[PDB]
Design a protein around this ligand. Structure first.
Ligand SMILES: [Mg+2]
Ligand SMILES: [Mg+2]
Ligand SMILES: [Mg+2]
Ligand SMILES: [Mg+2]
Ligand SMILES: [Mg+2]
Ligand SMILES: [Mg+2]
Lengths: 260, 260, 260, 260, 260, 260
């Protein structure tokens, strides 16, 4: 069984599902807890986003959430605080295989994101596999030779500039998905973080169509179910449909109010 | 403003509301996190139960949850793992003023629970108020003289033995409320922790009525809203109407299912 | 896949292996770290002992070690600090199914250990399965009805008194295995925690044989490999053959010495 | 009350006091503990500086110190390790509203500090308010529209270069205060971190006068009471008068020595 | 140097100083922080009391405080939450050699405290020295044979019952010192934790004299310096003269007040 | 003794041993635990590398590992995640005196590493010694004047570019040692992280010879003992001969396999 476990651990199931065009339904994790992460790992989502940008996470809390999530069918995705090669290196060594990189503005930045995930000559990933949960402390055989192909890089387009540079970003080898962040986008477009305006919606839907056309996976986070279904219909392949903090806050609030 | 903060830290608002016959709507906290505790402190509940019996909490995590909840209107209640004077002492020194004591079987045990919370001569509470958050490290004036009166002891009746001893338990001075645990009770009655059986409901209803007629506050945890309203109708004064882990688990499950 | 994950979370593989007379090779975990626990879960042991008696562990660190170990074939066993029903309750709710109970002196104490692990009417286990990782927050169907049968209670015999009471201890229903602690035993016999004396070895051998003849599983911790094989030869079924702190300390020492 | 709490939480009282020219007396927090932070929150200071530059703090320990301090009249100020937009973003999302930015050398850097705190179009603050304690997980109404005006940016001038560029820094919109760091300044001036030299004192006092003249708030940390009063007389508006580690170390040392 | 480090780790310097009649000046540690413990270990105290009774400490935080204090001349003493053999065992295995045991009421209880600290046949201390920091994971040679003699047991007398039993308590072999808790004592005597009353002072003075005449070490905690010197004058040998939380709280308060 | 402790703490024994040409045998610490660090501090190594680049460490876990290691003869060395002046500043303030800086490509970068460790005018180290464990909260006398000379900067050459720039790096004042990272080097040379190729070995041995020739200390990490002895023979002065995670994983694996 250990052998079975290790020859099984390497494979990036999320990446494989995106390549095959299987839509993946996700939940955002901002509770920054390995305990609630495990609870939510059993809810039935295809993927769970561990947010190191907008939730108080770091490399150490990412590690314990990956450990919590590990035995479940739900697949972890991790958002670094920015497109930082050092931070990406550290997240990969604790076992991150799927990265959601915020604020990717152009093809150079997208390329930098991809190269941060890959060992030389294909990138600049630093080698420390004996030390790393990524290789299970060198129990995964041929880890150094197998690692690059199982990395999944998803880049966020969150500004008008990023939207303008989209065709070039879609040309970058190793960018597997492009995620539209509606809150940051509408803010950049002058709608103060509220995406429910026709101009923001048009830019979002056009982008999803262009992304899918290139053969890459479109992604988005949207709490409105009707909009989520509509993005799915247009070809989005990684769609986060809620946020743990929001689910908890709204369920508790609605419950308290039912009792006055 | 510091004088003003301290001369109001002392006051037990939950105990005052129970004495006045104001019904208090509660949420159970099993997430064991100061982060989600603060989030839930903003939802509008009268009280929040920090569970040290059935959730992975200790004195240390109780402390950080009390700190998180402090500026909000919601009032903290703490459940020790058992009727243990040592643990009760430690919970009180970190600032706990309202205790929900599990598995109180008779009047002697209820009396022991009360005495654990009170300084001599009215009890056996150990003195270390310079060290303790309870007195805000001695910034609350005359803490040793004001502490006993602001302690609020709630005892759980969870077995047929406990239900038989209810009249005597209710005669114990310092027992402010009596809480029925329907799952433990139904388990003891032969229904395996499933309270939705006529015999269990009848015992619960009779106990609520009996508690309230003796001038004490009846308490209960119940996830079913219609049962909750019925118990409120009957005179229950501290009613927890959901559990954070359950709210979170069920909302995430339903969300995932809506997308298949 | 979630249904499939849950309908297999319930099953105690260690208990099943012991019942079938399959010898189980174990490693003791005193490092008190979810990080090294995961590392050691990949090494190939049948079972890992999370020590809450002689290592700085608590319910909280047990929980994170269980999460770390979960996806691996190695099965977790937990040692509480003593035969304490409250601590046992808390360990079970975080997901512990196999307990190694220290200093069990007689059949009454063995019976108390068994009853602490079982829901009424077969025991006194407190009910809080909505809150607990044990039921995966109620995602395991019919948890309350399936829990008792998957509990595996191992009792330590560590004194001459305990050895005398062995026949009666072995007659206790629910005692699945009997573990001999050679250090505590030799200490009680007047050999100061050093088990390598003929009189101690003879008592150990006789107990192993006696345990196995009664149809129960004999257990032991032994760092000496040849003694371990001998005890296996004699019928021992759960044998811990080293301790993580010792493995680490001795390998580092020998390495340093090779370089002067 | 929840409504009252939220419509009350948004307001930056420290910023309002500085605009009104009310001098604010502060204590530096380097103990990196939510426990001692709460203790010191009751001491009567107008503000408390949570030091992420010279004390072992990070985003997570800042969060728990803010939670500890929250119910007290003392107002939190947070120093990031440097003028880092990513780190500033993370500190703001956990609820930081007043920032003390070290090593601001010129007006460009001061402008970058200001823009890191503001949502587009006024800055580059990333939007993730559903996830954030800053908005109380979206319970503060109109958070996105109200947030920019409640941010308070204080910049540190700590070198001869910064002193030379002071007139231009004072022209930067959104810089509410300018803090002189005497230890770093004297070091840059060739006095090895000791500010008690006439040339350092002259540069400090001249700067305080120039700062106040521009209508912005001068600030400083000084352990000497006589110098503190003298800086206050010259118009300094945010003056930290001690450091928790120093208060503790000196009180304990003086106590031990009194007993030989 | 490792041999040299280990052959000096074993020795209890506090116990040796008490036996020689050298007065030891102490500081109480309620901050529950390994960081402030190290800071205070440099202040010049003979001993530091890590409080597990009235401060939010556990075995885990005791361990990190012992590690922090280790390289300094100040000697650690640990107070368990009560006279509990299980907790005492766990405290000893993490390296505690000097215990201050609260609420010892009679000679039987004093004897139980002593026996909890000693390996058979002189006591009931459980054997797990390979796992324990106490033996430095077996690097201290002949640990099992040297441990008992380096244990130092101090018992608190805190009630009128305890004062009556003092002669018998003092006849217990292994009781190295007797500590009077003036707050608990005055509370029991009817003075509500306020020891500054003639009757309480007289009982304290008489006990100090009685303890010292029996050849044992008298101990006390007292924040008032002149009372401390008086008790020293009378023969007290372990005298804690302040509390870290109090030192910190009072220095910060006085500082704030000097600035209004 | 406090005086003795402080006037003793300042001295960098590792730096002194390198200047005197005493070879130093090391162990890498990737377990990221203050507990196992203390265990390994007693194993007999001259130095221990706390890895903040490839192990999940941060400033806070470095701090607790330094505290754990402090009383032992083994000397701590710390690797930051990169040549980052802010991170270096924070590591120095918690007490790091010996730094191993990864990915130093040229003499400019080496100079930046050196200047990050030194107070003005010799570098850009920020001054906050009252707050810092580095000065023992200002108990080390003349800390500001003594600190620069006790800093020990070791730079890693890990690419073909770094190897080409070696002569210039060796000319940089304050670079005390040059460490070859074989895994990163062979990766850069096209051998995918496996250093056991003649071309990698030749580049390594030539570099060691050039380093020692310049009068600076060569260093390396190598798990093969025969290669370690061979690098030592050529003049390497800081040689790490194993990794804690590897020692633990391989000892546990070999043990499990001996029992089938
Ligand atoms: Mg965004
Ligand atoms: Mg119950
Ligand atoms: Mg034993
Ligand atoms: Mg400065
Ligand atoms: Mg006392
Ligand atoms: Mg490297």
């Amino acid at each position: 069984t250990e052998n079975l476990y290790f020859q099984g651990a390497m494979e990036n199931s999320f990446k494989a599902a995106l390549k095959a065009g299987r839509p993946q339904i996700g939940l955002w994790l901002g509770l920054s807890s390995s305990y609630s992460a495990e609870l939510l790992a059993g809810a039935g989502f295809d993927w769970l986003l561990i947010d190191g940008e907008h939730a108080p996470n770091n490399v150490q809390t990412v590690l314990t959430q990956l450990q919590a999530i590990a035995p479940y069918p739900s697949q972890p995705v991790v958002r670094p605080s920015w497109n930082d090669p050092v931070q990406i290196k550290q997240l990969l060594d604790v076992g991150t295989q799927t990265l959601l990189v915020p604020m990717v503005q152009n093809a150079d930045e997208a390329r930098e994101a991809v190269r941060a995930t890959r060992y030389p000559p294909a990138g600049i990933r630093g080698v420390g596999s004996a030390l790393a949960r990524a290789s299970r402390w060198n129990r995964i055989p041929d880890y150094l030779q197998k690692a690059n192909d199982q990395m999944c890089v998803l880049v966020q387009i969150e500004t008008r500039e990023a939207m303008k540079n989209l065709p070039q970003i879609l040309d970058v080898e190793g960018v597997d998905g492009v995620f539209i962040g509606p809150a940051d986008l509408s803010a950049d477009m002058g709608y103060a973080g509220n995406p429910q305006h026709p101009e923001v919606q048009a830019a979002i839907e056009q982008a999803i169509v262009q992304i899918r056309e290139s053969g890459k996976a479109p992604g988005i986070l949207i709490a409105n179910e009707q909009l989520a279904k509509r993005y799915l219909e247009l070809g989005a392949l990684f769609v986060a449909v809620g946020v743990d903090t929001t689910l908890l806050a709204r369920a508790a609030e609605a419950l308290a109010a039912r009792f006055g």
